Design a protein around this nucleic acid. Structure first.
Ligand code: CL
Ligand code: CL
Ligand code: MG
Ligand code: MG
Ligand code: MG
Ligand code: MG
Ligand code: MG
Ligand code: MG
Ligand code: MG
Ligand code: MG
Ligand code: NA
Ligand code: NA
Ligand code: NA
Ligand code: NA
Ligand code: NA
Ligand code: SR
Ligand code: SR
Ligand code: SR
Ligand code: SR
Ligand code: SR
Ligand code: SR
Lengths: 154, 95, 160, 140, 186
RNA sequence: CCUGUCAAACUCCAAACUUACAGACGCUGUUUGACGCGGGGAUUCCGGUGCGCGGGGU
RNA sequence: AGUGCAAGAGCAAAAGAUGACUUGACAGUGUUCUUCCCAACGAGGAACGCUGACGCGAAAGCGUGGUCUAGCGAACCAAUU
RNA sequence: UUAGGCGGCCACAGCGGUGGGGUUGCCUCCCGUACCCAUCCCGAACACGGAAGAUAAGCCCACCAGCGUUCCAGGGAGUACUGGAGUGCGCGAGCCUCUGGGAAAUCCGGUUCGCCGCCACC
């Protein structure tokens, strides 16, 4: 399970790529989604590679992000342990976060919006003109590297 | 194109590889297909009769009956539905 | 005409003589020089002139550079010295010139050129250890008559 | 082994390449059977503009008709070594040609499952000379 | 053979046993083929149908197994051929086969030949096969009368191992009589 | 035998890639009716630029 | 190699050669594709059927001209069946 | 299949080569022209009739890789080329990095001297 984050805008980006991002339930910059690692899903992130930031997040970081940015399928309602308890199949955020990573369920399946609408990266990101290996912020990330981003955009 | 005939630019698709030269095996020219059967269209260079328009090579239609010994295969060119008259010699069963 | 008009590879490969007529003869007099009866493996030293950029070299330059190179080898090693040089490339690319403005612009055949990719050996000489400095000089004169910068690389020379 | 290997006469073809006929009458009387005309292909400057048209004739003799002819034909010739085909055949002279071969030749002359005769079973110039020479005459 | 560009014929063409051009025209009918093949000593007749991995023989008959019904005569003549056809045609009727098209392979369509005799027998057995009467041999020659009259020009016996001196085309009659009979273990 | 070079109108080879059909995942539709069909009304048929691949031409 | 003619393509117990017989280069009416990729548009064209009448072949079968892609023409009026 | 018929795939099956196999069995070569049929001339072939002989051909069986072909391992090569991205480099033709793919020639060692279906048959 990887965490996708659109870091580059829609203007001038190929249509077949923009459509993929929308199929992955992500419509705006800074929006994040949790995608399972399957053959099909793998082909999709590869296509989006240059306009996104992805990687497997740590249980902790995911719990932080879920608590702060997750939303119901409709409404403002805060997604906290109490919420998770009365609507999901889990006991608390940690239970949910674990199931996601282990790929046993999805946010939509539990009645949560498939998108985590994140805040801009505090202290800014490493740039949208280069990949990770070049000091940029685009493409695949280290579990530690992705966390730094998600936590920065908490 | 310099001209607009049916065989325009069909130099490659309508030619056999050296070892595939000469008369083709009868088996596939007599094959029987059923309605609803998915079939691949590909003109056999060695067989003169029963061909379809070269523009349709590569299509995968659906047998929807036959006219004489030839078959009536339904296809979708772009967004337009078309019915193609083709003999078994130029057809292969999908899968 | 300037080489600037033909040096770059900016047109399709135009070589098919069965469709092109009136192609001018090659000014390149010879491709095998020195002692062509003796083998290349009979020489201790093998030095080649390597083109650093991918270009098109007209037969006029091929001849001019080949000439100024071998002419030096003759002067320094005699007309029958113990060496043998080679021009491995041949002018296959047919050139045109539109010489009525841009209407019916397909030009007429004016010459031929050899396409050479970067890193390739245009020339390759074979000499004895004693004559290595003369061949290096022949090539120094040869690269002054062709468009790209070149390297004078030794492929068989522990004698230094 | 020796039996299904000893050579025989396949056919004896007597032919006269004229070029424009009246010669059919002599071949008929000399061989014993009726002859056939010979045509041609490709236009020739030696007055042969008509493609399909009589130029000569021939007669293919087999069995008795062949031997009975050869008994009186061979004496008329002065056989040589060079006059032999690599297949063990020979021609001399009105030309006379003798086609020689080993027993199971039908394998390559039939229609069903025909096959070309192996080189080890094909007659040789030497094996031919011998067989022929061993029948009323001399070689070289 | 020579190189990569070389074209080697189909195996059954290489072997010169199958005429593919005629095989196609044959297959077009949709009916099973009454394969009529010969041998120096024997005659065979197969009822062949088309199959996913090769042909299928639904019924057949060899002139050798003709003796299994009371045949003391040779097996490479006209009576033999006709009878082999009738036998094959009968086994065919038994298997559900009702019609067929004559496949003579690389044999010649000579008037009165054995393959036409083979065809006449299969038709007589009850099979619907497209034919042409005036291409079939005279009923007497089928019986083997041409051979009985040949032995008439005796002085020396036609047959080696004694079957009979003057031969018996009546044996053909006796055998045909036997096959047409409803019983008989096919 | 050896040795030196090529091909838009060559090919014993041969991609990336484009493409037909089907399944799966995704997205989407069944009160926001998709897909499709029928009808009314257009405007439009001087385009331009960047990038990739081009063809002509210094 | 040959297969009438550009070029590309097809063909070897043939689609080529020879021989013989024959006139299907037939009448009527369609299906489909093409012409016009997608996507509407005529004449023309081709593939594939049916009805009728035929040729050849033992028969399956082949023949709706020439192995395939060029060789073509509206309304009005005239002549013709 | 102790030798057969019809095939599918249509060279992994081609080309070339070595060895073995047939009393009333099989396929052949073979023997022979009264007939059916046959040759623009030849019972050569085609067609018919038949066994004195033979296993030399063919065919069937076993095996060889020199040529051709199929596939595999390693090398060439993640090279050549390439779909996506870059305020990366270069006067420029052009190159590079990241991401997703990925040859060809050739070398070397293996493989391949057909596989399979139906019927019949000591
Ligand atoms: Cl079509
Ligand atoms: Cl047979
Ligand atoms: Mg909401
Ligand atoms: Mg700040
Ligand atoms: Mg910045
Ligand atoms: Mg092309
Ligand atoms: Mg008018
Ligand atoms: Mg008129
Ligand atoms: Mg032997
Ligand atoms: Mg720059
Ligand atoms: Na073919
Ligand atoms: Na002008
Ligand atoms: Na029309
Ligand atoms: Na004549
Ligand atoms: Na043998
Ligand atoms: Sr250009
Ligand atoms: Sr320079
Ligand atoms: Sr394209
Ligand atoms: Sr035609
Ligand atoms: Sr004979
Ligand atoms: Sr890979």
């Amino acid at each position: 399970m990887h965490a996708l984050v659109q870091l580059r805008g829609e203007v001038n980006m190929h249509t077949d790529i923009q459509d993929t991002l929308e199929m992955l339930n992500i419509h705006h910059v800074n929006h994040c989604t949790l995608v399972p690692e399957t053959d099909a899903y793998r082909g999709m992130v590869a296509k989006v590679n240059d306009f996104v930031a992805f990687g497997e997040p740590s249980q902790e970081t995911l719990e932080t992000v879920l608590a702060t940015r997750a939303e119901p399928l409709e409404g403002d309602a805060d997604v906290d342990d109490e919420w998770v308890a009365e609507h999901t199949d889990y006991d608390d955020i940690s239970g949910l976060a674990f199931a996601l990573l282990s790929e046993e369920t999805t946010l939509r399946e539990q009645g949560l919006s498939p998108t985590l609408r994140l805040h801009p990266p505090r202290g800014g990101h490493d740039g949208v003109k280069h990949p990770v290996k070049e000091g940029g912020q685009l493409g695949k990330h280290d579990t530690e590297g992705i966390d730094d981003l998600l936590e920065a955009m908490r | 194109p310099s001209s607009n005939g049916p065989l325009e630019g069909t130099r490659g698709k309508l030619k056999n590889k050296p070892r595939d030269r000469g008369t083709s095996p009868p088996q596939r020219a007599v094959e029987e297909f059923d309605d609803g059967e998915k079939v691949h269209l590909k003109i056999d260079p060695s067989v003169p009769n029963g061909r379809f328009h070269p523009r349709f090579d590569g299509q995968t239609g659906t047998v929807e009956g036959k006219q004489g010994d030839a078959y009536k295969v339904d296809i979708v060119d772009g967004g337009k539905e078309k019915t193609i008259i083709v003999t078994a010699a130029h057809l292969r069963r999908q899968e | 005409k300037p080489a600037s008009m033909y040096r770059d590879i900016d047109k399709p490969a135009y070589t098919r003589r069965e469709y092109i007529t009136g192609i001018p003869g090659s000014k390149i007099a010879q491709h095998k020089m020195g002692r062509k009866q003796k083998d290349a493996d009979d020489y201790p030293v093998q030095i080649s002139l390597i083109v650093e950029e991918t270009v098109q070299l007209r037969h006029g330059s091929l001849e001019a550079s080949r000439l100024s190179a071998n002419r030096h080898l003759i002067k320094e090693l005699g007309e029958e010295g113990d060496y043998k040089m080679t021009l491995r490339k041949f002018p296959h690319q047919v050139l045109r010139e539109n010489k009525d403005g841009m209407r019916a612009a397909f030009g007429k055949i004016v010459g031929t050129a050899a396409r050479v990719q970067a890193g390739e050996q245009l020339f390759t000489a074979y000499c004895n250890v004693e004559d290595a400095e003369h061949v290096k000089e022949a090539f120094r004169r040869a690269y002054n008559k062709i468009t790209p910068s070149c390297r004078i690389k030794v492929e068989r020379g522990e004698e230094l | 082994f020796h039996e299904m290997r000893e050579p025989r006469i396949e056919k004896v073809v007597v032919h006269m390449g004229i070029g424009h006929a009246n010669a059919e009458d002599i071949l008929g009387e000399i061989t014993g059977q009726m002859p056939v005309r010979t045509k041609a292909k490709r236009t020739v400057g030696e007055f042969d503009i008509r493609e399909g048209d009589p130029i000569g004739a021939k007669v293919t003799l087999r069995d008795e008709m062949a031997e009975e002819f050869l008994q009186t034909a061979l004496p008329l010739a002065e056989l040589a070594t060079s006059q032999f085909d690599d297949t063990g055949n020979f021609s001399f002279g009105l030309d006379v040609t003798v086609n020689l071969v080993r027993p199971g030749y039908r394998v390559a002359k039939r229609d069903k499952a025909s096959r070309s005769i192996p080189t080890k079973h094909r007659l040789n110039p030497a094996d031919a000379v011998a067989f022929i020479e061993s029948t009323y005459d001399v070689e070289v | 053979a020579t190189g990569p560009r070389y074209k080697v014929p189909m195996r059954r063409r290489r072997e010169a046993r199958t005429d593919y051009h005629q095989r196609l025209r044959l297959l077009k009918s949709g009916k099973p083929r009454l394969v009529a093949r010969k041998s120096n000593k024997h005659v065979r007749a197969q009822l062949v149908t088309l199959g996913p991995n090769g042909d299928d023989t639904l019924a057949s008959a060899h002139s050798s197994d003709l003796a299994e019904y009371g045949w003391e005569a040779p097996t490479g003549n006209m009576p033999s051929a006709y009878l082999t056809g009738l036998l094959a045609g009968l086994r065919a009727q038994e298997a559900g086969v009702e019609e067929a098209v004559l496949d003579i392979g690389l044999n010649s369509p000579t008037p009165g030949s054995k393959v036409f005799a083979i065809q006449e027998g299969a038709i007589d057995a009850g099979l619907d096969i497209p034919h042409n009467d005036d291409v079939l041999a005279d009923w007497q020659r089928t019986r083997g009368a041409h051979i009985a009259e040949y032995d008439e020009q005796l002085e020396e016996p036609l047959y080696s191992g004694d079957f009979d001196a003057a031969d018996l085309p009546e044996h053909f009659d006796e055998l045909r009589e036997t096959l047409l009979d409803g019983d008989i273990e096919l």
